[PDB]
């Protein structure tokens, strides 16, 4: 009811409602360290929060006080804990609480507690119906919010809400094809619905990545995706792949291409392929083009890649 931002806001110590209760100052000790110089407002709420906590006062006033205490430090998991104790004791309408948390996440979407609190409510209500639209709204303002992806994954799994998600992916990939959270989600769906070790989809997938990597050749996300959906079968079980990259070395070159070309030769070599001693060259080479010219930030990586090979593919 009385907002922390209100010009009318009044300190709890000045409130009639609160006279019977004595604030509990923080027990910081005789000679404090990392003592925070709280605003009088912060100090006041938390002095009273401590009072309602130590007394374990299950009241409508303790409930409202959690709201302010949260607004002032939403990372305070002791307050959130007490708030949920209060939602349950006071038998608070959980949709109204769900409305509240919508609003708070909207204001502090990077806070972990706030998402945690929303999961709990969703689980209490056993109702996912507002989530995807809600999460979509947070993603519309920061499309790589980790917690928002983590809550989406959780929702989708726990209540099996897969059916329109790859559609969400595509939407978002087309907004920003560089968003690694959306590539990651693409992979989350597919591997949780149809699959990759399928033969027919591994192939609309492998397909589509190459078509993005043509549009944006220096998009690391696609390359990691393409690499992602093949590396565990073996990149060398797809021989057309090699030739098809070796098309774009003149026109669409990148360190990612060369970097990828190298992963193939390792796989190729690891299986006895044709030209073991020969292939070992095209790669060892490529490691030095990378370490010395096109990808020097990784010289220590590449010098080691050119050489773990020697270690194992020598003689």
């Amino acid at each position: 009811f009385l907002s922390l931002d209100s010009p009318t806001y009044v300190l709890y110590r000045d409130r009639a409602e609160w006279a019977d209760i004595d604030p509990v100052p923080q027990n910081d000790g005789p000679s404090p360290v990392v003592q925070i110089i709280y605003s009088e407002k912060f100090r006041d709420v938390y002095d009273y929060f401590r009072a309602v906590l130590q007394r374990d006062e299950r009241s409508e006033r303790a409930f409202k006080l959690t709201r302010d205490a949260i607004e002032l430090n939403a990372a305070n998991y002791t307050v959130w804990h007490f708030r949920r104790v209060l939602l349950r004791s006071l038998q608070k309408d959980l949709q109204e609480e769900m409305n509240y948390i919508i609003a708070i996440i909207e204001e502090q979407p990077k806070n972990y507690q706030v998402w945690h609190h929303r999961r709990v409510l969703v689980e209490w209500l056993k109702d996912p119906s507002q989530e995807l639209e809600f999460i979509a709204d947070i993603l519309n303002q920061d499309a790589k919010n980790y917690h928002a992806w983590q809550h989406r994954q959780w929702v989708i799994q726990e209540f099996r809400l897969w059916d329109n998600e790859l559609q969400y992916v595509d939407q978002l990939l087309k907004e920003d094809v560089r968003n690694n959270s959306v590539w990651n989600q693409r992979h989350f769906v597919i591997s949780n619905t149809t699959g990759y070790s399928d033969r027919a989809v591994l192939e609309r997938e492998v397909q589509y990545t190459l078509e993005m990597i043509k549009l944006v050749p220096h998009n690391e996300s696609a390359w990691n995706y393409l690499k992602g959906i093949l590396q565990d079968r073996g990149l060398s079980r797809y021989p057309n792949l090699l030739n098809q990259l070796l098309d774009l070395q003149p026109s669409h070159s990148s360190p990612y291409l060369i970097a990828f070309l190298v992963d193939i030769y390792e796989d190729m070599l690891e299986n006895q392929c044709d030209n073991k001693e020969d292939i070992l060259n095209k790669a060892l080479e490529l490691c030095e083009i990378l370490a010395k010219e096109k990808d020097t930030i990784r010289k220590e990586y590449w010098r080691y890649i050119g050489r773990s090979l020697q270690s194992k593919h020598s003689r």
């Binding site: 110089i37 605003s39 912060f42 949920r84 999961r119 907004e175 990586y301 270690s311």
Partner: protein
Amino acid sequence: EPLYSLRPEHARERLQDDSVETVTSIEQAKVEEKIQEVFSSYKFNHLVPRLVLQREKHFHYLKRGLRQLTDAYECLDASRPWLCYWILHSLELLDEPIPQIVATDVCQFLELCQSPDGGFGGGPGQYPHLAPTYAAVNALCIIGTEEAYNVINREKLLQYLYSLKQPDGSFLMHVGGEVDVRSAYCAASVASLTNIITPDLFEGTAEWIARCQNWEGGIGGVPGMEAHGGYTFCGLAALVILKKERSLNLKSLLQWVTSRQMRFEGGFQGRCNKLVDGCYSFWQAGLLPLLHRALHAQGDPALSMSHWMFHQQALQEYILMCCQCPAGGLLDKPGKSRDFYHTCYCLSGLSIAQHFGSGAMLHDVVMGVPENVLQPTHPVYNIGPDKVIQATTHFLQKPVPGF
């Protein structure tokens, strides 16, 4: 000659946006544009670059913070033992000793943060949580005086830790919280330093951690999540501690981290296609001293005996040029505000980048003036390798207390 970032070849490592502008590309260009301004300022001002770690300024910053923080830090009011940790580690890194005085006041403070039922909360009378438990234990070890060790209730701590262990290997962050890779690491870190590990305590835990390794190479916060910087550290460091380094695809991981260093800026990003940030100087780059001990303990004879598998020099250049506040303290990236978090992790990452160790072989790479060298840091606990010795040695003088 002599700074990597200032070389004319370096103009090339700028972002090619393919002609295809997205949010991701626009925001990286903004950052690169700022970073280029920093790199270029020496040329434009016509001075010789000289990279200097503003030790004394950082030291006054941390000295004062260790006692008093502005209401800027109201948002960290449930993270007070983290503040103790960050500040006391940065000071140990800067080789600034802790007065027996302050040691004892950290001690009594953390006692106050200690829960009756075990663990530490984020400040006095706050319920316990694993994150501030970790911080507390580390800060106690940094101090390393018997008084500091005696604060920790190992029986209770072992009880608390069981209260958080789940069926499938994972650990809750706190009672009626949820699981996350961070919590297995906090559990594994504190369990070992204090010796309260039991055979069944981490039973399940490595395989839960390997479930978090995704198709990208890195580890995400829970199964199915995108790979992310500090969560990857937590998983590997958790495994290293348990000795299950086994369970990951270390090559896929090695390869994910290494791709995280930004070719232009020199620092690390936490996630693919996101921005550089100095704190990943520790979380991302601190993976290599772990991947070293691991790829070594699995016989990899192609491993370097002089250098870690990241560009040590460019990382130092990023940190030293782009992440220092003149008034002391360090930052995420230029234009951001100092904080004790970024001070701790930029410095811890600076140390890593400076010190290669490997069984026998110790080799340093110190950009700038020789005075820039920090004290070494243990890449598992991120405290001094000495404070670790002196801690575990002690807590083996005690038997694993069960419940």
